[model samples]
Target: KPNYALKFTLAGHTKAVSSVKFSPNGEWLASSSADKLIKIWGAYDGKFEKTISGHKLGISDVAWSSDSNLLVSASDDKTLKIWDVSSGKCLKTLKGHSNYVFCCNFNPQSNLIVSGSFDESVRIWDVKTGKCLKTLPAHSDPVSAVHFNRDGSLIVSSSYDGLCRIWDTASGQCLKTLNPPVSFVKFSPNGKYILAATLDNTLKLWDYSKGKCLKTYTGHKNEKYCIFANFSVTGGKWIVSGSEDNLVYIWNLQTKEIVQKLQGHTDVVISTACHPTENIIASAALENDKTIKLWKSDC
Candidate 1:
């Protein structure tokens, strides 16, 4: 059988695009780039829907709220901007970090936004009141990725300083910390386990409740740069991930074995995200290609 692919070329930014994400309803796609702008395109056809520009420096990350009406962006200028998607206007600007804010996320259940920065702190903000709620200081280096559990009861963050820490959202306490810095960390669909990709080219699964490492998966020789290890929406057992070696690996979680290696990107895979309701995967490359490639899992 022939494999499936989707090519979406969005032209607007003068620089390389850093991040791309589908809206909660899967109708709009938001992309950010080093050109200091965020562009919203129709997810199905890649039509230019709107362009948002305000950042003084290059934008590093972009996230959409669960309702798909609002968007959040972090920039190298050390500020986070909130925008109303429909009007393409800045609704609020959050500032406090002493350095670049690399990543930010919105809680799936509340009006709270969380961000991690090179200033060595993680902050929670109240979106409605534009107030800072809790400041978490634990990592000694820049936090690369931050994500909330399915229920928003806990937060998992990976840092460049060789540590992945899980924190209790309510009390702002460190629950567990994994050593040897991970580039990405994601909670499983059931929120019972965590998958972390480290610089050692290995993926480790940990039991969230027991704080114990359950399994370690090693296949690629090169460092596993970015990963999107999630279950297949079509059911059964399947996991997908991407690495710096220009390969995307699909693993059978039940057997703890790699099922296939997808190769196409000529450069390092910088990031990846799975579709919420399909066997499709999206990956971003860190090269002059300036494109987001989509792949199918069932093919």
Candidate 2:
């Protein structure tokens, strides 16, 4: 099956591209790199728009405002910056983390920002005031990922410590800690399940309420590098992810059967994100290759 069409390839980052994301409105696409620069492009076409530079070191991750007017990025410089989407100007500089901040995102309300860092702490901030609201010693090892539920009532974080912790926002208490630590973790589109991907070449779905295992997804390689997964815009019926084998894999959410395997990149694929309102998907290749590829399907 021709799972992907290779619509276009975006080249900008001098260093390896770290992450890529499509704006919520599906109008723009933004990507960060180890070169300490971020680039914005046209979502439908691969036209370069503008470049954003401010971070002293490589950028690790990126998130967009709910309204698609702002972008947030975490960098190795131990700081995060909020950028104005249209002007490409750094709106506010958020500084607090002691070490390189890794994974980060804006809550559902877009009024709060949460970031996990190599410092073994998770910090929350108020976007309006640029104030650090709370910082929790999340894990013994580096916190690799952090995400909030759809309602913003809880936060889930994964670490190198082989554990993922779910915290109650209002109480700041650890609600549940899952075993066999994961490298990438996030909530499902419906908010009824959580998907955790580990270096063991396996991904698992969970019941958040009781912290029970629901389903396990396999048949992919993730032993050498960290990879992320996302639910399709088609109502989460399809799960999509990248592979260390330089390919993209899409599975039927219900049957757990492999549906699509996309290939083109010459290097390992570490990040894949589906558009919030379209069937289009984007992926970032690692190290020697610094390109972002876009895909289109008949779905």
Candidate 3:
């Protein structure tokens, strides 16, 4: 196993960093904050690149297009802003969600952006035309997170209502619904499993095809914040997440054991991003600790 160590502590956001995401190409790391700014940093060295500002309120989450040349951000201002990564300019503003837009992701083709909102709706928007293609009244409460499956054919979303739902991207149909009082939800690299951060202080890997939870990863405090967890295979196939205990937790994908616990943040670490193709991971905390830390393994 690779031993991960902190490489850099990045500071830019003046308010809490709500989310962080690495570009698909693994060159830049995008971070969104309650300060209403999205900052781009060099992926490897954590150098400041540029700041994207347009939203009137805090930004909730950010996602990069497949080409890594475009970015989409969900904001508490109740809109999704699509930006040109290189120019740092907002290209289109998707306005429909009556409440805060909480999470978003681009499909594999980079033509569709799927988002979840506090308005209790999951929306699919056309990346090129900025049109609302489909809207699903997804949850009874706020939708916390949303992501596209590896193939772009399905979308999985989690809600504060204690349910996770899978939808057909093509037909806007609800295929399945799983529940465990989830906060954040993601699909596995192979698209065969669903990894969800449950409020019960564990992350569950679900075989969504059969609606079966295959494994549960514990050893972290996640009862309050909507912590983000992801699968990474740069050093090895592993799972990682930020914890309410002010640390980052990584687990062996197959063994379901706590492999490493990274420490530094003094407050709840609620956001994390695993490098797309390297032995690097980025994490950020809540408002009390408005900083991002980059960790790397000497693979």
Candidate 4:
């Protein structure tokens, strides 16, 4: 496997960085942390831009609006907050979850946001009004992941109940239930596939249209932290995710081979995000590490 050169170290969080995501435009990055803060940065140079502090507890998940001007974050405070990226102000605070809001995502158009929570429910909110539009009593246990398809017609959620459910956006009807629930799920950038970071220490790819598991990529440590996996924007040739073993693993999408391992973090590598339009990758480390690292390869 080829090695990745570390670009820079980001040290703004006082606690573990839980998640990091590039904006749809790939010009900005957002990271949420156990420090009860959300930070925005310049995607190209890892320059600190701003910090958003409002969550009463550690932030667990974050999503970017399609325009890259806004961000939505979910927290252990059992709430979700929207932020104005340019002004660095909290636009709205969404409250409805009875327990920790574990994960969230904005629809393709950024007009709607959906969140899954420990309360065993998935709530869809109107991004403009900051109101809960609908609530789906999704699973028997805590919901760990939530994502909308590229077109926003469908939403998939994963739960601790060991089931991943697909739902119709307009009808709120359960379309299908996949056994062995995943901790994190994401729709491929091209809208052709779905990837799930399963609880079994592997990553599964599915044909969302046919709703079948098509492949599995393994050989990384996962069984716990709900680490996320994503396809590179360069056309899904690569898949990347952080591992509990303190490394970032990059896999060959078509070959199902572990092609590269990026090592630097001193503790569990908690989250990862591949740049949407570049050959760069971002990863966050757990408490003992408390930093975000940028990675790049010569290719």
Highest lDDT model number: 3
TM-scores, one per candidate: 0.89, 0.96, 0.98, 0.96
Tens-digit per-residue lDDT, 198-283, candidate 2? 88988888988778988888898888666888878644468888888888888887788888888888788889988877668899
Model 4 C-alpha lDDT versus the unseen true structure: 0.88
Model 1 lDDT, full chain set: 0.76
- The 0-to-1 C-alpha lDDT of every candidate, in the order given, reads 0.76, 0.87, 0.93, 0.88
Model 4 lDDT-worst window of ten: 228-237
Where does candidate 2 stray beyond 4 Å?
A: none
Q: Which stretch of 10 consecutive residues in model 3 shows the poorest summed lDDT?
A: 175-184
Flag the better candidate by TM-score, 1 or 2: 2
- Evaluated at residue 288, the lDDT of candidate 1 is 62
- Which residue segments of model 1 deviate by more than 4 Å? 1-4, 7-12, 221-231, 297-299
Query: Residue by residue across 137-227, what tens digits does model 4's lDDT show?
Result: 9999989889998799999988878777888988889988765557788778766778888778888998877889888999998887788
Residue 51, candidate 4: C-alpha displacement in angstroms: 0.9
Give the winner by lDDT: 3 or 4: 3
